[PDB]
Design a protein around this ligand. Structure first.
Ligand SMILES: [Ca+2]
Length: 279
């Protein structure tokens, strides 16, 4: 399948080269997989989701995304225009309030929630979780990411927006999950992407068009916008049969565009997510 005049990041992760605007992908498009967006919530009523998105948990007084962040990230995973994995089932977990603030203990609660809940859902092609959030190093926050990953959920985390080595941030520094930095449409590491040997992969994160609440769209920027490219990609690769939840971060790295970003410090991977679908 081909989707012309696509947001640049979907064209990028289907291409070897920057400067193209068509997104290519096999039409299965993540059918039969499940992605949990653990964030401010998802405006599931957005027609872009077509009935495939459900809130399933909140730790606050409403499960609605009253911020916009969770809805944008979820749209990159799996909205019909703006998504990678256009036939995946989405699930929301509101661990962030509406300003974007969550305590670690509730974040943790969300995470263990997914390791359990997946067993209430039909995900025969595989389970993913997408965490576009974080704060300073915590062993506990990190342990809750290793558990979620160990439980057979592909875990994708934002490396962080401080232009700092990410080993000091959580859940980014955790080893066993897939820590995502960001790039721009000219293949520059993004000016705000954390970096550091704990990264596995880079994805589009500067000027990412996606859904927003009210039924709307906007372009925003972050390792948060890069993260759900890799989560949706992993859903797409599960569904095909290329990899598994426990093997997907390695498979994506093995199949990445290798050498191609500027602005990658010494010691940080120079790997860019790629679906290998057109070449
Ligand atoms: Ca890893």
């Amino acid at each position: 399948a081909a989707q012309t005049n696509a947001p640049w990041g979907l064209a990028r992760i289907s291409s070897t080269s920057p400067g193209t605007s068509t997104y290519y992908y096999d039409e299965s498009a993540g059918q039969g997989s499940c992605v949990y967006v653990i964030d401010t919530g998802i405006e599931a009523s957005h027609p872009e989701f077509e009935g495939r998105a459900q809130m399933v948990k909140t730790y606050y007084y409403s499960s609605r995304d009253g911020n916009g962040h969770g809805t944008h990230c979820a749209g990159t995973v799996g909205s019909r225009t703006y998504g990678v994995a256009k036939k995946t089932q989405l699930f929301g977990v509101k661990v962030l309030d509406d300003n974007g603030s969550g305590q670690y203990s509730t974040i943790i609660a969300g995470m263990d929630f997914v390791a359990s809940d997946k067993n209430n859902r039909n995900c025969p092609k595989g389970v993913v979780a997408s965490l576009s959030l974080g704060g300073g190093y915590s062993s506990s926050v990190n342990s809750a990411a290793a558990r979620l990953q160990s439980s057979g959920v592909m875990v994708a985390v934002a490396a962080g927006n401080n232009n700092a080595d990410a080993r000091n941030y959580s859940p980014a520094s955790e080893p066993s999950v897939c820590t995502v930095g960001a790039s721009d449409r000219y293949d520059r590491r993004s000016s705000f992407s954390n970096y550091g040997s704990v990264l596995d992969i880079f994805g589009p994160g500067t000027d990412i068009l996606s859904t927003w609440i009210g039924g709307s769209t906007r372009s925003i920027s972050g390792t948060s916008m890069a993260t759900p490219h890799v989560a949706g990609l992993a859903a797409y690769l599960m569904t095909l049969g290329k990899t598994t939840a426990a093997s997907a971060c390695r498979y994506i790295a093995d199949t990445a565009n290798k050498g191609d970003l500027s602005n990658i410090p010494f010691g940080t991977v120079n790997l860019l997510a790629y679906n290998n679908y057109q070449a």
